[PDB]
């Protein structure tokens, strides 16, 4: 049900990115309004897909999908492996592990058992910040008649 | 023609400030990457 909209939003994603490809395929870049508009459409599609994806994360994890005997697997085999490859691209996983290394908390603090207190401090600073924004947003506010004259110049009546 | 500068300029100010507060309230809370690009776009 949700993927019926996922395929449409990803279709508009492919169309938008293809339009950006056509705009960038020229020698000189055209106007920036169309570029920024297509980029906003792309971001809207990505956010629209991630929202419904995160909304239905418990249902998709409660089912398995694998092809039926009605499948030409005797001729092509690697393609069927590509269609159901859970393994991410080595760039997203590689830079994902690198970012995990450049996050300020590693597994050495997992051994120390100490994360919920830092999260609590974070949320507290969210409260303080939102209060400061409450105050700082509470500081400011957001002659005559031409026909009669000519009638005098031609007849002399007042 | 000055009223277009009133409405337009004031709208840019409200989008700047309010969008800035929305920014700071979204920096503090693949969801993480979508937060990266939403913050960057703001």
């Amino acid at each position: 049900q949700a993927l019926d909209a996922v395929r449409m939003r990803l279709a508009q994603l492919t169309h938008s990115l293809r339009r950006i490809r056509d705009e960038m395929s020229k020698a000189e870049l055209p106007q920036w309004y169309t570029l920024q508009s297509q980029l906003n459409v792309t971001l809207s599609q990505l956010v629209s897909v991630t929202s419904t994806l995160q909304h239905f994360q418990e249902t998709l994890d409660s089912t398995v999908v694998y092809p039926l005997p009605k499948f030409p697997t005797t001729s092509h085999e690697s393609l069927v492996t590509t269609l159901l490859r859970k393994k991410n691209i080595p760039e997203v996983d590689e830079w994902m592990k690198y970012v995990r290394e450049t996050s300020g908390v590693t597994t050495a603090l997992l051994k120390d058992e100490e994360i919920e207190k830092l999260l609590q401090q974070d949320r507290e600073i969210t409260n303080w910040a939102r209060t400061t924004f409450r105050n700082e947003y509470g500081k400011h506010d957001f002659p005559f008649n031409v026909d009669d004259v000519l009638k005098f110049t031609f007849t002399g009546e007042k | 023609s000055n009223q277009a500068l009133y409405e337009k300029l004031e709208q840019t100010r409200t989008i700047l400030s309010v969008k800035l507060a929305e920014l700071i309230n979204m920096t503090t809370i693949a969801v993480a990457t979508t937060s990266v690009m939403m913050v960057n776009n703001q």
């Binding site: 990115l17 950006i20 000189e28 870049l29 920036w32 990505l46 | 990457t33 690009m37 960057n40």
Partner: peptide, 26 residues
């Protein structure tokens, strides 16, 4: 997402800011 980020940076490297002419692309 990451690829889009790449494009989003590259275009921002070619922005010419003018108060009377707007944004140009060198």
């Amino acid at each position: 997402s990451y690829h889009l980020n790449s494009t989003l940076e590259s275009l921002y490297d070619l922005i010419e800011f003018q108060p009377s002419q707007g944004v140009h692309y060198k």
